[PDB]
Design a binder for this molecule. Structure first.
Ligand SMILES: Cc1cc2nc3c(=O)[nH]c(=O)nc-3n(C[C@H](O)[C@H](O)[C@H](O)COP(=O)(O)OP(=O)(O)OC[C@H]3O[C@@H](n4cnc5c(N)ncnc54)[C@H](O)[C@@H]3O)c2cc1C
Ligand SMILES: Cc1cc2nc3c(=O)[nH]c(=O)nc-3n(C[C@H](O)[C@H](O)[C@H](O)COP(=O)(O)OP(=O)(O)OC[C@H]3O[C@@H](n4cnc5c(N)ncnc54)[C@H](O)[C@@H]3O)c2cc1C
Ligand SMILES: Cc1cc2nc3c(=O)[nH]c(=O)nc-3n(C[C@H](O)[C@H](O)[C@H](O)COP(=O)(O)OP(=O)(O)OC[C@H]3O[C@@H](n4cnc5c(N)ncnc54)[C@H](O)[C@@H]3O)c2cc1C
Ligand SMILES: Cc1cc2nc3c(=O)[nH]c(=O)nc-3n(C[C@H](O)[C@H](O)[C@H](O)COP(=O)(O)OP(=O)(O)OC[C@H]3O[C@@H](n4cnc5c(N)ncnc54)[C@H](O)[C@@H]3O)c2cc1C
Ligand SMILES: O=c1ccn([C@H]2C[C@H](O)[C@@H](COP(=O)(O)O)O2)c(=O)[nH]1
Ligand SMILES: O=c1ccn([C@H]2C[C@H](O)[C@@H](COP(=O)(O)O)O2)c(=O)[nH]1
Ligand SMILES: O=c1ccn([C@H]2C[C@H](O)[C@@H](COP(=O)(O)O)O2)c(=O)[nH]1
Ligand SMILES: O=c1ccn([C@H]2C[C@H](O)[C@@H](COP(=O)(O)O)O2)c(=O)[nH]1
Lengths: 221, 219, 218, 218
């Protein structure tokens, strides 16, 4: 399965997909009691749909992704309500030592009172101390659902995400944009790369006529 | 894959595609404990467990796309199910064909009426023919399609694509595969259940035994 | 507020929760703040609209009572992010209420048949279909079956609860020349009520987010 | 109506549209009718609940203002049929407010170390994490990056707009012993407010549709 590594321990993996560019073509044509025609006229229809705001046909293309990301990234991601999610539980699972530790280059462009290297080390210390406490609590009999409240927001979680192409394009408009947090931007770029490979016509038409973000127009795949 | 079931006099329900199966739900449920699939036996058992206890989100990862031909009055009820995607034939854009649902006398099989049931079928076909001819005359005279079609009756057939996940589909079956729903849509619901059963046997059986609230599927 | 539409239709406002300030407060919570001043607050609404910050507007909710022809309702009910409760032809005996277009509805079209004749032809179908409907029910045919002979111009009634964000989507799509003329009229009524209750949001919407054309011309 | 929850949290009702009669009006439209009388209207609410006619309750809408720990909010925000606007760690400097469980939270569990010490250990990490956070911010580190060291018990604040149907789903799932104790407390507060504003609906809900366990015990 296509799997793209993100951040230091994260990833985005495509699990399954239903439909393709032609699915949208057929769904649009039913309006006129028609179906598919030719690869030329059909690709042209996708462009027409995109530039005129005919979005419902794209709801028939559905993706399911497997994602590993820090909780602070997931919190933002899960705000996209038009989708389905199933996530790893801290109430039910003993948590592993997997945290997002940003490299010094994450602070590139900002003037700091201390070396970027120090910030990275400072974050690492908090992680170590918090996880150590988490383990001490669980080993002592503290219920998992309580012990985990001391763990930081950079803890990695895992989830399945099923979303249709229309909602996915909304996600890209909002997250594959410089105003979004850099960390989720990286995930949106991976999502875009997978989208591009499975629905090339839809993706191209989207970038040329509907995309309202900036990064996908300044970054290849 | 593909399956097609004929409904009423000229309708049908066709499965266009499907993403996921019973194991998709098992996997989605297991992620909670950082696990995946296990064994054929423990997995089917997990499905019954999810159904029994109301853990419904794992079933959202199973998605179906159907192609349906049904009368407008049936489609009006169907389209009230908001958690789904639809694309339908348009009377504003397309010239409409002579295709209407004419109930057989058997539709009234059980009701005592003043005039013969055969008469009812005749009366309906007559009004349908009159309305359709009027529609054609208007169209032929240059009246815009969107206006000319307002004289067409509710039994006119329409066609649409329906993409829906298993969770919403189960809600649809609870409400439509039931004696309280109109008979005509009960027929379509039975076809939908028939296809659901074929593609997700474990989920369907678990649904029927522990969560299904309707009655016709248990008969 | 009630506005008459078409020949027998209407749009009536039943209830409303929130106002322009509801969106301001919802927006300010991001920075752990609330309301400020009448001037700063309106500027914020414009800011939200201009930059596509739409979620704050979901906290403003409206409930309308609408009477419209079924062909109009079919299009309206395609708007899934909303709540609906409608009159039932399965349960209620239907009244003689149909939308009959006036000749003026065909202005701009050259027809082989005089516009007035079109109105008459539609009235004819309505009368014959309704009479058939009544005859069937009086004979013993269940309502849910007898009503299938009634035309798409039959009037229905429904309650519609929708938040401002979904309402703006509705206006973008229906208060537009590409939408069927009949629903455009309802959209204009909906817009008028929206403007009355949330003038800042409505004005900002028209200036920076509205994608339709008619509200710009009317 | 404001109710304190946990050590520093709360649930407050901000606004509400409709009441029990809104559902009655919405339901009766099916038979082209309106309200009747107290006795008949209360009876209809029970009938709807008993037979699963849930859409009429979507016309009752509530807006709450809630302050809860992030781990509670993560569970809460999984309820998609609702609207949310929340405090942002990317844009605002975060305050020193965390949920520190009191020793009683461990009542019933067998631990090797006194419960009071568990409370003490949690406070220690919280203190260290927050200090680290402040140190980074004052050194020029962007807020969105500095906050990643903060634990899941940090309090957040949000506005929640939800209709009665979705609210009842939330109570079925959260006002239940299988839900985390912390969110059960919030659900009990939400339930109290719901009961005060829509007593007929709440009573019918508890009698015919509620699938949880605690609301039948408390
Ligand atoms: C740069 C950035 C900064 C942000 N800052 C904050 C912040 O400070 N605080 C905060 O709380 N959130 C914040 N968010 C989250 C934001 O408010 C949305 O929750 C998030 O973008 C999900 O978007 P959505 O509503 O468009 O998508 P979805 O929830 O997936 O919805 C997709 C579409 O369906 C719609 N829709 C879905 N549900 C409803 C509904 N109930 N009513 C009306 N329309 C609906 C709309 O057309 C929507 O675009 C931020 C997001 C970004 C990208
Ligand atoms: C026998 C029968 C008689 C009926 N009679 C009438 C009638 O007289 N008048 C009439 O108007 N309708 C009538 N209906 C339609 C009914 O009101 C629903 O619109 C229809 O059943 C679709 O169901 P749903 O809301 O459960 O499904 P969906 O719209 O697909 O929703 C699925 C689930 O998501 C939910 N959900 C979706 N949207 C919202 C929302 N906005 N707020 C809260 N929860 C939401 C609920 O948990 C719901 O069960 C009837 C249906 C049946 C089966
Ligand atoms: C001029 C015109 C012509 C039309 N012609 C046709 C036709 O020929 N055939 C036909 O079938 N329909 C047709 N429609 C209906 C159209 O396909 C939509 O169903 C209708 O506009 C409702 O819009 P909506 O999806 O944006 O709104 P809502 O359903 O209210 O949704 C609002 C927002 O939430 C979203 N959203 C809701 N549900 C989902 C979902 N499941 N997946 C992804 N995003 C979602 C999107 O961001 C959306 O804009 C037409 C509409 C117009 C205005
Ligand atoms: C005790 C408990 C343990 C849990 N454990 C986990 C866990 O380990 N991992 C995890 O990921 N989650 C877990 N959850 C969250 C759970 O999976 C749901 O996300 C949460 O209960 C929100 O419920 P909901 O979907 O019913 O509500 P909403 O999202 O508010 O939806 C309300 C109704 O609309 C519906 N609906 C909304 N969207 C859709 C859709 N896309 N398709 C079909 N129907 C839809 C259904 O009828 C639904 O009941 C847990 C919840 C509880 C109460
Ligand atoms: O870029 C952002 C900022 C905020 N939020 C939503 C996510 C959380 O629900 C809440 C606070 O997010 P943070 O700013 O703390 O990440 O608002 C996002 O979705 N994206
Ligand atoms: O069994 C029913 C009855 C009604 N409705 C919804 C469909 C329409 O939006 C409106 C009226 O439907 P009819 O009763 O006329 O079919 O209410 C259904 O979905 N199913
Ligand atoms: O302007 C339009 C045209 C179509 N449709 C949706 C409504 C129906 O579900 C179906 C066919 O509508 P008509 O074209 O027949 O009105 O497509 C709309 O919502 N608006
Ligand atoms: O009782 C629970 C357990 C889990 N989850 C959802 C919330 C998060 O998205 C993810 C993990 O939650 P925790 O178990 O870590 O709280 O699953 C809930 O909504 N409620």
């Amino acid at each position: 399965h296509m799997k793209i590594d993100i951040l230091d321990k994260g990833f985005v993996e495509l699990v399954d997909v239903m439909g393709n560019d032609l699915s949208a073509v057929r769904a649009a044509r039913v309006s006129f009691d028609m179906g598919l025609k030719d690869e030329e006229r059909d690709r042209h229809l996708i462009e027409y749909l995109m530039k005129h705001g005919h979005e419902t046909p794209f709801e028939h293309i559905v993706f399911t992704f497997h994602v590993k990301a820090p909780i602070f990234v997931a919190r933002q991601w899960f705000r996209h309500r038009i989708a389905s999610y199933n996530e790893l539980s801290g109430r039910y699972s003993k948590l592993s030592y997997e945290f997002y530790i940003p490299s010094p280059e994450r602070l590139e462009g900002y003037k700091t009172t201390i070396p970027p290297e120090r910030v990275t080390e400072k974050i690492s210390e908090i992680v170590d101390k918090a996880y150590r406490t988490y383990l001490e609590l669980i080993e002592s009999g503290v219920p998992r659902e309580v012990a985990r409240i001391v763990l930081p927001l950079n803890l990695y979680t895992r989830f399945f995400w099923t979303v249709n192409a229309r909602s996915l394009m909304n996600f890209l408009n909002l997250r594959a944009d410089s105003h979004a947090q850099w960390e989720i931007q990286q995930y949106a770029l991976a999502i875009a790369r997978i989208f591009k490979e499975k629905c090339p016509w839809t993706f191209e038409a989207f970038l040329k006529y509907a995309y309202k973000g900036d990064i996908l127009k300044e970054v290849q795949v």
